[PDB]
RNA sequence: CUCCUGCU
RNA sequence: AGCAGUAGCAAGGAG
């Protein structure tokens, strides 16, 4: 019972991995059984104190909270897979039987006349014009014959790459040659870009109401008792009745329907190229309608692991002049004219190649779960307010309470716009949806470090005299992870403007 | 007009505007390619933190050994982290530790630990994560690798009759004494292996990349051990688990209130308190297991004789573990056309085809490389001792130097909150530099970039930001609301269970619960292709519901997965949908749904929609089809033993003789008992008896 | 006459060659690690493959003989219900589930299923007969306790329950005779008068015993009185910034 | 030329 | 081409 199997090799093993002033495990155990401490410990402690050279840094005397270094370089392009602000859509009344996406593609082929969709072979700008021209003609006659299977030509064999991968040769045969096929490896890292200036306009556009009403297909309300279900149902009715009108809901339903259709077509047809519409579904004058924003082309995904990076080709419908700064990765073509009754303005066809992935589908196709942090935030505001007042003041608190947002452009010093609380939850669903779009590594590390600087600002707000030990490596770690993601650079700029606004009352910062 | 969300913080707290700063709605970061450079960074940086060059030759392993205790080359750059522990200092802190609470402390907790060791059955090993099967050199779940290990035991010499923990451990050491071990490879041949290769293979730990972690820019490598290292680590984690449960300065919301409220009562007329949130960096590369061997030689300097020898093996196996090197790298020509793959075996011969960073990492790891692995001797990787370094944290936070200026606080895995009590700010420099001194001596490196402090409670602990009065709550994982995907009945109520348990523990204000409830309803209906009857959906499942709806009398008794609306609410998240619709169903509908005679259920909620989809098709098309033959034979034998013992899934079937002999003894037992009070027939008793005798002669042959 | 069938199955499974090296070589406990051979890694996205399954036309494996005893090949407009691709098990679609649920025969089993889930019907019965009041909107909070949360009337402690089902359902290899038997053996004399003749299988009976007798004690943040009547309604009664209770009886 | 995949 | 982010995918395997 009380005997362990004393082996032969392990007793030579445990005697080998003892500390250096010991010979065997037995001598180490006999010293550890009879160990009594002393007060030469303090001599080793103070002897560790003397050779340290480390001082803390206060903030009331050396408030070196300098603003971050935005890279002053070429402006970061528009890197979202679709178009948010610059869209144009064709409408029709929605038919209940004609509901599948290829049926929607055909019904919008007769509805929006593609016979007048004549493009010159010369783009305004871009890189490859002939390939997208013959691709658009080939898919236009392909939708004309009402069958979604692109016949193999050199254009699709060039764009959605077939045969464009390296020959992975294992090290069983190598057939070496004298100074020929000299092979090695090389990595670079990431490219650095600058501050985008267009992101304010898509922010203010994306939180503005659009006359088409509801966009997100939510579900029905459960029945309520005489309990607090009147409260939660009331908050769902008011908040849901606010978020259904903005363009953020149109983008979320666009991602759900479009990436849902490309997702099920990535399941059902590997190895075959489809033609998938880019659309929505929303209510217009009571009559439920559907949209049509663009045309997507799949790239014969054989999704082995969660990655795989299949090719998506997006033909887009715009009605604005292009931009070689913002719309830089695009290959802007044209279309013609559209009658827009407020006269018959222009219509531009855009082109873009891009890629999606299998892990980058289920976080986009299930992006409806963004009403949790917004309603959590507004609900913690209201519940903390009535928790500090101890009186049922909810419905009148949702109108007579201000929220400071959106300082102006020319001046910033205490010049803010106090808005109502439902416009605050508009901006909250905007910033949560922008979090759900642009998630990379850089946003994660920058959210960590802005949690630290937010802790410093809260340490400023109540005069607590915060302090840090080493600020050089701190700004070395923050400026490492601000490279090319536009949301991260934009939030860094707005964090600097947060310090500029907060510098007017508290004293822990710079100009 | 510009716009800035962070202006919400101009007149608020950070207990309300902090859920705004978690990017949990997006995709998590994934790794790509091999996981070689991360492992070489971990081991190479671990030896770079060694602060020594003293090598000791080995006779067991053909590579050198560098020690990590009491051999310090004190460079002047002491702000850089060190990986050297002084043993008299930490044993002095242990003797100082037990003198604060009780006298017979370690004997008490260690006797309770051994009181829970000897009553443990080793099926507890199968309730774990993925491990490293050394038979085929892969990653397998725990019961598979344990079954292949016991298969190597009963294939090599004799059989196994242990059915405990300690006899299995002695069986592992008995495998270490063996000169030759036979096992099976792939189509199932049987090979043999020597003695030194078995020693090199039992100490093999696999490395990989940590996938899906929120909070870092650079990726980090996690390592999984084999099977023969796990149960000793389970013993140590039960011991230190009882020690951490007994201690009072370890972790989560009440203890900070008791220590802040109590240490505000220990203030004189001129003293004050300053708290500091820190973050101990490089925690997995500065905990050498030799100090675990010495301190566990203290806690088992006074336990017994068996526990004294059994709690001193897993630190040795962490002292001479190997490290798997991923699967190599890739090379390509100037035209970027052909790309050869070099594995971890031929990395030595093809050394001259690498980058500058790779050759910088590789030439400082060359004198420790084996053929496939590397030799690490002081590292403590992820997937290892977690509740034992916390004891070192409490030992740093219970120091007594003798004024009346001192510190206290709270410790976690690598997160700590420290409270100092002093009189002036240069004395604060003295005490905090004493804290960096004692942590720096013991082997705990605080990072200077990620630390701060104030006077009141405004601190940070395990992503809970405590302000002066109010409490921040943990930002939960959003995909955890929908994780089942198994049934039309065990997904919605599972989501209500997740909303319930996230409502009780966290705050989770009710409108968020109603909103996420209706959203999880919407993804349920969108997943299982079922819509309500009044909707305009016309697919292959709503036409049947649309045509036959006139037969149903009361419309709101239909299930959600059959075309009914929602009746659950916040105040009924603990009750499934089926009962609250069973109080209203039509009798043809209730008698029609709840028939157990259905082709779907035959071949926790009410299982009336439980169907089994078809499996994948690489189960008979790969080279591992014989493994599917093994799972089919195992399901047949388990259905045989389940067919004899009518109630076997309730109690764990202990016993150490055999299965088929207990089967034959049970059929003879019920044959005699059901004979004499029952059957009585000569052809049946002699015929069943004839089948038992012929099956026993068939099994013995 | 079941022992003859089990003898046929036992001789049939000892007839195999390489299965002789499977049994009488391992132990009784090894059955547990003979149960788990799930060579799938983690199934880290089950809902993804569930949506991939339900999006196809025939994802489901179902029995043939009952559905060919009662079902119809196709519905009235193009709805497929049957396959002939592969033992005799037939792949179908989820339309056959709801088609059984609206156009299938019925077997009267209402009282049995209303007797299986008596704990949850007790929960709904206690929920339907309660009354509420106004809210308060005040601060609240108290520490975490280990609370038994079910209105049971026996209050065993997760140890006499497994032993109880051993000494109720199958006593031939039940347990070593302890000192915890006698009054629970009077309870054996009461309980064998209930589960003797039923159509319910033994696994479902062993399931339903352990939910009428077990006070489920968990470590939860509680406040106020610690009566187990209001502990399953813990998530409803109060949150962090609000509180509601006006129950008279 | 065919077959097979869809976490191995 | 492109997706990328410290190294991968842009199909692969067998007969």
Summarize the structure.
Chain A is 37% helix and 10% strand.
Question: Strands, helices and their partners?
Answer:
The complex is a heterotrimer of chains A (511), B (701) and C (249).
Chain A: H1 10-14, H2 25-33, H3 41-50, E1 92-93, H4 101-111, H5 130-144, H6 154-159, E2 167-169, H7 199-206, H8 229-243, H9 247-268, E3 275-278, E4 281-284, E5 287-290, E6 294-297, E7 310-318, E8 336-339, E9 344-356, H10 359-365, H11 371-389, E10 403-405, E11 417-419, H12 421-437, H13 441-461, H14 472-480, H15 486-502
Antiparallel strand pairs in A: 1-5, 3-6, 4-5, 6-7, 7-9, 8-9, 10-11
Chain B: H1 36-48, E1 55-56, E2 65-66, H2 87-98, H3 105-117, E3 131-133, E4 138-140, H4 142-156, H5 166-177, E5 181-185, E6 189-193, H6 196-202, E7 206-209, E8 221-224, H7 230-246, H8 254-263, E9 272-279, H9 289-299, H10 306-310, H11 314-319, E10 322-324, E11 329-332, E12 338-342, H12 356-362, E13 373-375, H13 389-396, E14 406-411, E15 415-422, H14 425-442, E16 452-454, E17 459-461, E18 464-466, H15 492-504, H16 510-527, H17 542-547, H18 577-582, H19 587-593, E19 612-613, H20 625-644, H21 660-676, H22 682-700
Antiparallel strand pairs in B: 1-2, 3-4, 5-6, 7-8, 9-15, 9-16, 10-13, 11-12, 14-15, 17-18
Helix pairs in contact in B: 2-9, 3-7, 15-16, 21-22
Chain C: H1 2-14, H2 30-35, H3 46-54, E1 60-63, H4 67-70, E2 89-92, H5 95-102, H6 110-116, H7 118-128, E3 144-148, H8 160-166, H9 182-191, H10 202-209, E4 217-221, H11 234-237
Antiparallel strand pairs in C: 1-2, 3-4
The structure holds a RNA duplex (8 and 15 nucleotides).
